[PDB]
């Protein structure tokens, strides 16, 4: 088999790409409800950590794939490991370093992450946590993300729309902040609800039949995830984490965070 070597590694090599992602999203899934079993930290502390990683990604011009991978590493690590408040940010720093060295072409090194943490950790503390996360993750760094499923869904858009794609990615990142209602849904289901809600807002069209035959998810299958996602869109300006609404109000995303959300989804 012929394969091209490169720096980005969160890509499915030649094999139906969508069929491979569905089989892998189940494996290495974060244990839902670990935050209740977590003694020191809570969901509100995780939402702040994930929101701070969004600002780190925007500072170093990191891809959206690097952000979703870092959040996947945090939830899986915290599901089987107990971390304190002061070390929680160290876990997120090392997780962002792992996702950068795995997906980015020119990733920020350890000295860069020590710099952005205002010199509160050492080069060894980040490397130890990075090595600790690797051992906990059993070195399985390839994980399907909401960004990966959204890319596959866009190939079936007829026609394509820049506002729909940008709004879908905006809704996808909002699910990373709140772990209470979204950690129980699969990345393919979250991307499906984000694609429909974005398409319904911009154009009014619904979940296309081409995606029904390809994914098997019907509109009723996505209805539970679509309900929680519709409320976050309505309560987005009131949410305490606003680093994603500021990110998606730029010309690069056609300012989709400024679009008014629908009052009713008619579902």
């Amino acid at each position: 088999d012929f394969v091209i070597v490169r720096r980005g590694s969160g890509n499915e090599v030649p094999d139906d790409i969508h069929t491979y992602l569905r089989e892998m999203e189940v494996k290495c899934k974060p244990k839902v409800g670990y935050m209740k079993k977590q003694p020191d930290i809570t969901n509100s502390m995780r939402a702040i950590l994930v929101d701070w990683l969004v600002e780190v990604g925007e500072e170093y011009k990191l891809q959206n794939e690097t952000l979703h991978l870092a959040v996947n590493y945090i939830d899986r690590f915290l599901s089987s490991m107990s971390v304190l408040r002061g070390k929680l940010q160290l876990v997120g720093t090392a997780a962002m370093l792992l996702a950068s060295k795995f997906e980015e072409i020119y990733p920020p090194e350890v000295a860069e992450f020590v710099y952005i943490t205002d010199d509160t950790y050492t080069k060894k503390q980040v490397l130890r946590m990075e090595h600790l996360v690797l051992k906990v993750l059993t070195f399985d760094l390839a994980a399907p993300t909401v960004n990966q499923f959204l890319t596959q869904y866009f190939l079936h858009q007829q026609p394509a729309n820049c506002k729909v794609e940008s709004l879908a990615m905006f809704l996808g990142e909002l699910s990373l902040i709140d772990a209470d209602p979204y950690l129980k849904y699969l990345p393919s289901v979250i991307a499906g609800a984000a694609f429909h809600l974005a398409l319904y807002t911009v154009t009014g069209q619904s979940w296309p039949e081409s995606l029904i035959r390809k994914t098997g998810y019907t509109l009723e299958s996505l209805k539970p995830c679509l309900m929680d996602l519709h409320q976050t869109y309505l309560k987005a300006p009131q949410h305490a984490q606003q680093s994603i609404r500021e990110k998606y109000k730029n010309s690069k995303y056609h300012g989709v965070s400024l679009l008014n959300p629908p009052e009713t989804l008619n579902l």
Copy 2:
């Protein structure tokens, strides 16, 4: 309490953010009328200095928060200290260095500010003035800005508008240049007049009721500040300081400085 360490420091930690800013904008307020008591410099000299700092911010891609903080440091320093003409620019250079090291992630160092001053000062002269400003400011560098109040007002916009937000920020920076009519108003009041004037120009809507219940400022409360702000908007092309109109004619701000100002505010 859980807190995330970072480089930017002009941010209110978890505590109602708007209630905290209103209590702090009164503290460390610049003494109105210090320019009359200033023997050597005048308001026209300050307007040139502030306008030159806008060009410095655009040269190093500095945030708008860094600019407002630098102006806040200058007015407070000049309120209790007498500075000559030749040393006035040295004060603004050190104030911009303080605001950069306080808010920016990768701030320009001392060598950068000596470079942009065409090598008219030394590394010690900037560091001495920087240390002198810190002692005069009693190391209280956190100060509410017009940019901070505008960010809070945008969360209550229904719906949001990119042209209204950019025009509001444009009017906010124009108040920094002229100290004669705007140093007597609070940052929350200036941001309120800038938000209404921008909203009235683009869409015709007025000061929303959601901001009335949140801030307490009515349209009559903002009327004195709105009168002086409406004249600066009308006399903006005739003003001697045009570094802000050139800054806000770019695609990043949707070219709001080219929009025609309203002839009458109907107030």
Copy 3:
């Protein structure tokens, strides 16, 4: 004769530029059907290599001329040389290095190409392959490209259109991926079909008469190439190589890859 020295070298010096390109596009033409005679690699492997070079060009902000030249060097080298699977990517890496050092002002050096290959080759392996490609190409690096013919065609557009020019360049790069139906057409013919298909999609106008008198290609002359190019446009979202559709969905190209292709060309 007066000539200005510079870094870019894929430019016709003063001499009718279009007449010179037509005479040179025939010389050093790739042998059609070499892939059938190629024992180890196939057309699907070449499509992946060319698609990976598009991502390399976007990573280093390389001009479109550098990409077309690299593909021209690969097809000519592979036409007279047999390469294995593992060395095929080494050929494309050296070809991209040659095109960069020939056209780019600040080209990526050998260390940059070794970096993007995930350190699978050495500095000598890239330099040896680079020297091997030069000897096979007889040091004739100047070759007319589809990008060069499109630039000449745009001067005769009445009026010019940003969407037509960007869509024409998008269709031009898609021909580089698939070598089976497009290696038998000349760059001037591919650019002609790409210009007409782009103009027909955006505005509905057809191949202008000003280009008929200048190039001699009529609409019937371009009809065979236009048929194969119309199918690639229709089957672009279904194609396995999507690095060009993602490249041309940016604001820099006015998002022409999101425009719906015509169902029938009426030819």
Copy 4:
């Protein structure tokens, strides 16, 4: 008097700025018709040199003021000095280095200009020519440009228009290439014809009365310069120097080079 030190030096210090520029544009004016007295070079060779400097400015992200100053240094130097073909490009290289060190904040150094010349000159050859140009120009580097007059004219636009300002700057740079019909006009007159032609094309409005009372130039006064400028706009796609049409087809200038020129100016 209070003055702020900075890097850019082509700026009129506090003094009516438009009145100062009119008095200085006459001083140090290039001798019209020097090309006829020039034994070795011609106007077509100068047009290529000026067009190549436009590409140099776009490579290093240099301001439009730096380009106009470099052309002003070339015409004045060539008016009193005879230069050969091979040394003509060396003169333009040194002139661009002088204009960069005079106007730019971070200007390209001597090593940068030797690099872009494909290492055809030495560090001493550029420095000698730079020192030779300074002695010929009598160290008077401050000269009014078409860009400076256009900036003053935009303050009187009622209302302002982004397309009119970008098209005016596009027409202003085209006058720098052709020295035969434009070296006999003053920069204030060229900027006046460029402003009217741009305003007439986009909106249909004519030379405003506010600029008549400020500059004294009537539409009949600008008519001779407007005739030659209207033909260059019509014959712009046919011109041999196309580095400015490619520069002004970008989103930064709203793609004004793609706008269709008027058939008749109704004058």
